[PDB]
Symmetry: C5
Subunit: 227 residues, 5 copies
Amino acid sequence: PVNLVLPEVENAIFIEGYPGVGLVGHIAANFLAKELDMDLIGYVDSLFIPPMSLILEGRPTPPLRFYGKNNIIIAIADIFLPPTLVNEIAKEIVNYLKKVNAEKVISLAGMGIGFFKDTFEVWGIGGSEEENKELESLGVKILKYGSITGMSGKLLWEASRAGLKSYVLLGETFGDRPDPRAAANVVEVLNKMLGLNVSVEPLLKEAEMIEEQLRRMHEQMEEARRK
Amino acid sequence: PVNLVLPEVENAIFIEGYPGVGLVGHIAANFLAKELDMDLIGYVDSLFIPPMSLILEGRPTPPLRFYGKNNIIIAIADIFLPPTLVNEIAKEIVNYLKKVNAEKVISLAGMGIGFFKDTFEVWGIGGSEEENKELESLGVKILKYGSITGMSGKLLWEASRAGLKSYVLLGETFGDRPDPRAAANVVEVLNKMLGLNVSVEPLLKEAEMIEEQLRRMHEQMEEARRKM
Amino acid sequence: PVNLVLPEVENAIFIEGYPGVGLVGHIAANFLAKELDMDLIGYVDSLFIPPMSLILEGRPTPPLRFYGKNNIIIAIADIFLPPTLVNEIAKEIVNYLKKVNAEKVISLAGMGIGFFKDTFEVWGIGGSEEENKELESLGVKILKYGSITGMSGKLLWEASRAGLKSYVLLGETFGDRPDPRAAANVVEVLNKMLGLNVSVEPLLKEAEMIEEQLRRMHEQMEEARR
Amino acid sequence: PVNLVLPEVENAIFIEGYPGVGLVGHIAANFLAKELDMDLIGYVDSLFIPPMSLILEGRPTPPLRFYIIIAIADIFLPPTLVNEIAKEIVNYLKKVNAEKVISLAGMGIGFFKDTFEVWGIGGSEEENKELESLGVKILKYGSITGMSGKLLWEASRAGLKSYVLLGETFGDRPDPRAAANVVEVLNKMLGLNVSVEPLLKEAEMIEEQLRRMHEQMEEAR
Amino acid sequence: KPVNLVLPEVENAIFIEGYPGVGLVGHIAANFLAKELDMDLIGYVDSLFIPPMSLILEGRPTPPLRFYGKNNIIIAIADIFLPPTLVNEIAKEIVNYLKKVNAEKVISLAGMGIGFFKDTFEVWGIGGSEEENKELESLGVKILKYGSITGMSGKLLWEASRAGLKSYVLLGETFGDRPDPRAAANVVEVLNKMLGLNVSVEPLLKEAEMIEEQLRRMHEQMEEARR
């Protein structure tokens, strides 16, 4: 039902940013793939993904794709998929990551707070206490109580169950709109965590434009959620 | 379609408190798992459970989980599942309980009265006459006529059909709101039945707050029931 | 997908009264099972039956059940099931009845008239001409034209195909309410047919109460029908 | 998923009149089965056919039945099930080396005329020529949906001689008069002498008794 | 099993797909070309999930999903707008067939909804790799840089290219809201240049009003099915 077309990357750092609240993970992951100059290395293939190519820089691309450079893989989705299919995809991802002895599984997500703050924060959660301690060492606050739905929640749990080091970074956000500023906050933490130096200035500079170009996608996603 | 990830506990006392009327069983079972300081020992795993983790005390947790201490297992669910899936889960639970020669299978449920009483009572029903007699020996009234829908009804029947000793404790409740006071009534009876030392005072103390925090969940659950 | 948990009963007379028009067959079959002091002897088991126990006299019981005494089996359902599941259950029932060489397969059903009559009648139909002649010998009128939907219709056909003696008794009824009086008419005929000694007076005496306690179920059933 | 309970009839002429526009084929096929005094010889059996017996002359009958073979259905079935049934029918007809496969259908015109016509189409040019050799006009362009369309194509593809006869009709109502037009052509084609007068005589009454079935069918479409 | 292609081998096929889509641009173009090049019906798609029907064309029963053929060219036509999973299954069988016969080119004809009137509606192109993009640029076709292509055309572009075939989509700009035989005519002109054919589009332009009227229900049908 789902096939991963994805070469083995030994000791992969796997970063997942599927669509979710504020599109925080989606914006962050797309920004990182582009800024780190990643190649398209694979995709998810299923009869249950609706028929489509996205054209990006004059190249056809499938809607669920993996970008790669060196030991880093970033997973992106341009459609918000139904729950059973998310579970099937998570299961294949975890089998892959087990197989290659992934070093880290990091989900990028949003946390809808329902009101404005002058400084939106980033929370973290780890798949075991060891990963919580790593996050605390980086000055990330640990989420104590709450819920993480969707691919990010499923991966956190399943990857940890498979004995992998798993994390979620959650950018606080309004809850009602695409939020490239929250995405920028998440990227800055990911930078610290992986020792990368990706500047988020281009993201903050285009925040208004990105908010506009993704407003329909966000609308699409919210409609699909409430089924 | 459903797998139980759950180590064998020989001679288990298995207590089930899935969401249902008043969230009586849900409140009771969550309270007990916390008050008896239980560990998370397993979960239900299925592609048909929607993708999520719950974070509890800085640990990721799945929505359908089993807590354990000594010979006791408590089963909890944070989502109200469709009927076929509840049947599949009940089947795997019963296979597990057969396998380990469970001593008791006890469901905690609510019974919607449809009006207020000054004193809501607790009823009992057993999977055979022997269990009914045990309940009567504790001073629990036996339900003579009615229906028990959902997990609690199914387990009562399926566990008994597997030759296990099965019971349901039913806290009378309004029928249309979260009822931690009915939950407390059920916990008091369970305490007596199993010789535990759990006070319900902390539950009664947080009744108002619990009723508030669960009011959306209750709403969710009633909506899902009307479809199904 | 469906399993019958049902011991073999040799030369069974199998009476089916699943929910249908007027709940005529349902009331009749429940009444008979109680009046003949039957034991619960089996049930239908399926993941597609929604999760529940019914409590009856302080015993948990499943919603699709078989009662038994001597050579008689009565099949009862408390839920109105979707069509494909009815067919799957009918198929397992007929396999069972083939297996045990059932003597008779008798469905109890209602026939909606669409208006009030001072005297509602009972019609009959047999799986073959032989069973029609038996019914005529008892003074039951043979339905010539019409349709019988649901379990009763399926069983009549499938059981007769399997070489079994098959019948439906149809109590005329309004069509849109529970009708214990029609049920009582059907029970009287069934009594004659099987040489039983069941009085319908307790049914007629509780008619009003039964109509009231089943009014929800009837509503449920009509909703599900579309 | 579908089983045909149907004995072999070597060199069968198979006539299909499942429910469709105007119930033209349905009325025609039922009329012929009755007027030629046919026996019930088989049925379609499937868990996906809803549970029922029809009582006809004091005998229980299934809703999809076979009575020359005439195939009748008293329910309007979903598309996938129609395909599954067509496939079993064609396997059967291949197996017995059927001589002819003839569907009776309606064609919705969308308005009244004083004289509604009958069109024909054949599975190959040979069958078109047979139809022309009597004064049946060949449909040149259009759509035949449902069992009749599927059988025309699948039976042809299996090397069988296939035809559809289409009675023009309003499109909106049961039409025993269109059915009568179709029966007259089928008479000529098979050398039968069935009078359609009893059909025309009861046209009103038939239109009334089938008005709910027609309503049912349009909803399901 | 679920979809079977009944289609003889045509070695080094040029395969042209024009399934229903926006403006019915591909559909009008492909039907026009099949007729103008005098093609025979050479095969069809067979599936229990295609609803039961025959179309009658020139007194011949025909199935709703068909292939026309002459010499090395195959044109694929559909008269019904199919659900997504079934489109994927059909694309998979098409690609297997094209692999098997070592197809020379796979060309999808599609529309691109602009949402307003232009005095001159253009044609865009996209290729399955950079080599095909360069071919299209050599013909003076503008390369689509960013966007999406849904339906059979999008799926084929990607899956054919993945199988190592040369794949293209030609996209005729159109209003987005109506059958557009003019856009179809624009696409046919480009296809002419690409394949070295001389098919005049004058008959198409001459009947544009009539075609728009005859297909207006089909276009309505299709838009309904799309959500």
